[PDB]
Amino acid sequence: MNRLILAMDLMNRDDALRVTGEVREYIDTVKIGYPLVLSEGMDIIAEFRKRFGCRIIADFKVADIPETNEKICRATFKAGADAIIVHGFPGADSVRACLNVAEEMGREVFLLTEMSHPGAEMFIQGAADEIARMGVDLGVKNYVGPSTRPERLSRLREIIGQDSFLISPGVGDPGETLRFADAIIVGASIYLADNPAAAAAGIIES
Amino acid sequence: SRRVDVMDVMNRLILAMDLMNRDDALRVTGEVREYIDTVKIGYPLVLSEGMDIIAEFRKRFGCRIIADFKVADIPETNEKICRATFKAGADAIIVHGFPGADSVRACLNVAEEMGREVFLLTEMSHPGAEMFIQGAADEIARMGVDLGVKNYVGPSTRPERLSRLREIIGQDSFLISPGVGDPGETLRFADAIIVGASIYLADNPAAAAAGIIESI
Ligand SMILES: O=c1cnn([C@@H]2O[C@H](COP(=O)(O)O)[C@@H](O)[C@H]2O)c(=O)[nH]1
Ligand SMILES: O=c1cnn([C@@H]2O[C@H](COP(=O)(O)O)[C@@H](O)[C@H]2O)c(=O)[nH]1
Numbered sequence: 001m002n003r004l005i006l007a008m009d010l011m012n013r014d015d016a017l018r019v020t021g022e023v024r025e026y027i028d029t030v031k032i033g034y035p036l037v038l039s040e041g042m043d044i045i046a047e048f049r050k051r052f053g054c055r056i057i058a059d060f061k062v063a064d065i066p067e068t069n070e071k072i073c074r075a076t077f078k079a080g081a082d083a084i085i086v087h088g089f090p091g092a093d094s095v096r097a098c099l100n101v102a103e104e105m106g107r108e109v110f111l112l113t114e115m116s117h118p119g120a121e122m123f124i125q126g127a128a129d130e131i132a133r134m135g136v137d138l139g140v141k142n143y144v145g146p147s148t149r150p151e152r153l154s155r156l157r158e159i160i161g162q163d164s165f166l167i168s169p170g171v172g173d174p175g176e177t178l179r180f181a182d183a184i185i186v187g188a189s190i191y192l193a194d195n196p197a198a199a200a201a202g203i204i205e206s
Numbered sequence: 207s208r209r210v211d212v213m214d215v216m217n218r219l220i221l222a223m224d225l226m227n228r229d230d231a232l233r234v235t236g237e238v239r240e241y242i243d244t245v246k247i248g249y250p251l252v253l254s255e256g257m258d259i260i261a262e263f264r265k266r267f268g269c270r271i272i273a274d275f276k277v278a279d280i281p282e283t284n285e286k287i288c289r290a291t292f293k294a295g296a297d298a299i300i301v302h303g304f305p306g307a308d309s310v311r312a313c314l315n316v317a318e319e320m321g322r323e324v325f326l327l328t329e330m331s332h333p334g335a336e337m338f339i340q341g342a343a344d345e346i347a348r349m350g351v352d353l354g355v356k357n358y359v360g361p362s363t364r365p366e367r368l369s370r371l372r373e374i375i376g377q378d379s380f381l382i383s384p385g386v387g388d389p390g391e392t393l394r395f396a397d398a399i400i401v402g403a404s405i406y407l408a409d410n411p412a413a414a415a416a417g418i419i420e421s422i
Contacts, residue, residue: 011286033279035286038294041256061278063302064248065332067403071226071250079253087278089304091334117280119306122349123342131338188282 001028002204003178005167007059007187008032008048011039017051019191024052026200031185032081033059046080055082061112063087066097073101073109083108085144088131089124096138108142111135113156116146116170128152132159141165145181147172153180174206212380215244215270215398217419220382222246222274222402226254232266234411239267241415246400247296248274257294270297276327277301281312288316288324298323300359303346304339310353323357326350328371331361331385343367347374356380360396362387368395389422 004027010016016036030048037044037058049056058081062069069086076084086098088111095111102109113135114120114128135143141164145156148170157166157180168177169185177184186203193199208214221242225231231251245267251259252273260271273296277284284301291299301313303326310326317324328350329335329343350358356379360368363385372381372395383392384400392399401418408414 009283009286011290033283034275035283035290037253038257038287038290042253060249061276063276063278065330066334068224068248068250071224072253075226075250075253089338090330091332091337091339093332093334095334115280115305117306117308119281119308119310122306123304123346124306127338127342134337 002026003183004200004204005029005031005057005183005185006190007169007185008191009035009187010191011035013040013044015191016040016044019196020048020052022196023190023200024054026197026204027054029055029057031057031059042075042079049080056080057083057085057110059085061085061087062094062098063090064094065090066093069094069097070101073098074105077101077105077107081107083110083142085110085112087112088134089127092134092138095135095140099138099140109140110142110144110167111140112144114146114149114152116148116168120146125152129155129159132156136160144168146170147177147181147184150176150180153177156180174203209397211378212397215242217241218393218398218422219415219419220244220246220272220398220400221405221415222248222384222400223406224248224250224402225406226250228255228259231255231259232262234406235263235267235269237411238405238415239269240412241419242269244270244272244398246272246274257290261295264295271295272298272300272325274300277309277313278305279309280305281308284309284312285316288313289320292316292320292322296322298325298357300325300327302327303350304342307349307353310350310355314353314355324355325357325359325382326355327359329361329364329367331363331383335361340367343371344374347371351375359383361385362392362396362399365391365395368392371395389418393422
C-alpha cells in the first residue's frame with residue numbers, strides 16, 4: 001500500500017500498537033524486528049497481524065550457520081511471520097537453509113544484499129553484487145537494498161531483474177528510490193513523529 | 207590457573223544450547239552442569255521460549271550466559287538489541303563484525319554503559335563461510351583490535367585460520383570457537399571450544415561432555 005513499509009522498532013507494546021494503528025490507512029505491511037520482539041515476545045507478531053490485518057516481515061537479519069538458520073526460520077514462521085529477512089554475507093548454504101524452510105511452511109525469504117549505513121562500505125559493499133547474483137542463482141525473488149546509495153540500488157536492480165521485488169530502507173529521496181525499489185522502509189521518521197499519520201501522509205505526497 | 211589475566215570457563219568447554227523447548231533445554235543443561243559452567247544461548251531457544259529463559263538459566267544453574275545473537279544490523283538497531291539482551295541478564299553478546307566498525311562500536315557503547323561484554327565474530331565455521339566471510343576475516347579481526355575488542359569467536363573447523371586469528375588479536379585477547387574439529391589442536395589457539403548437538407542430542411549428555419573433556 002502506497003509502496004511504504006513501516007519499520008516498527010519501538011520497544012514497548014503500548015507505543016508500538018498506538019503508532020501502528022495510527023498509520024494503518026497509509027501502509028499495509030509492517031516490518032517487525034528484534035528491538036520489539038526481544039522486548040515484548042514473539043507473540044507480538046500474531047497480535048499485529050490480527051489487529052491490523054497487515055502482512056508482517058520479520059527483520060531478523062538471519063546470519064548463522066545452515067542448521068541454526070533452519071531453527072530460526074521455523075520458530076519465526078510458527079510465530080506467524082509472512083516473510084523473513086536473511087543476510088547473504090554468510091554464503092549460499094545459510095541462505096538455502098532459509099529457503100528450504102520457507103518452502104515447507106508456505107512463507108517467503110527476503111535476501112539482504114547491501115546495507116544502508118556508513119559501516120556498510122567496509123566489507124558488505126564489496127560483496128553486494130555477488131551476493132545479489134547468488135540469490136538469483138538460488139532462485140530468490142525478494143530483495144532488500146540501501147535507500148542511501150541509489151547508485152548501488154540501480155546496480156542491484158539490474159542484477160536481480162525486473163520480475164523481482166526489492167525494498168530499501170535508510171535516508172534517501174522517496175522519488176528516486178521508488179525508481180529502483182518496489183517499496184521503501186521508513187522507521188523513526190514516523191514512529192517518533194508527534195503526528196505519525198501526518199508524517200506518513202507527508203511522505204506519500206511525493 | 208592457565209591464565210592469570212582472565213579465568214578459563216570450566217574445562218574450557220562451552221555448551222551451545224540450541225534445543226527449542228524449555229523442558230529439554232533445562233534438563234540437558236542441568237545434567238552437564240558438573241562439567242560446564244558457561245552456556246551459549248541463541249535464537250533457536252529464545253524465539254521459542256522467550257527472553258526470560260536467560261534469567262532462568264542463571265538462577266537455576268548459576269552459569270555464565272553468552273547470548274549468541276549474531277548481531278548484524280545498523281548502529282541504532284544494534285544498540286536496542288544489546289540493551290534488551292543485557293537487560294535480560296546475558297553476561298556477553300556475540301556480534302558480527304562484517305557490517306562494519308560503526309555497527310560494532312554501537313554494541314561496545316551499550317556494553318560499556320551496562321558493564322557487560324561483547325564478543326566479535328570474525329570467521330564462521332560452515333562451508334558457506336568461504337564465499338565472503340573468510341576473505342574479510344583478517345580485516346574484521348584487525349578492526350576489532352583497533353576498536354579495543356578483547357573477545358573473539360573463530361572456526362574450530364579450520365585450525366590454521368584459528369592460529370592466524372590468534373596471531374592478529376594477541377595472546378591477551380579471549381577466543382572461543384565452534385564447529386567440528388579436534389579439541390586438542392583447537393585448544394592450542396582458542397581459550398574455549400563451543401559444542402552443541404554432540405552433547406545435547408546424546409542419549410547421555412553428561413557422558414558426551416565427560417568424554418570430550420577427556421579427549422582434549
Ligand atoms: O541496510 C539496512 C537494513 N535494514 N535496516 C532497518 O530498517 C529500519 C530502518 O529504520 P529507520 O528509518 O528508523 O532508520 C530499521 O529496523 C533498520 O534496522 C536499515 O536501516 N538498513
Ligand atoms: O561460525 C560459527 C558461529 N557460531 N556457531 C554456533 O555454535 C553452535 C555450534 O553447535 P553445533 O556443535 O551443534 O553444530 C551453534 O549454536 C551455532 O549456531 C557455529 O556453529 N559456527
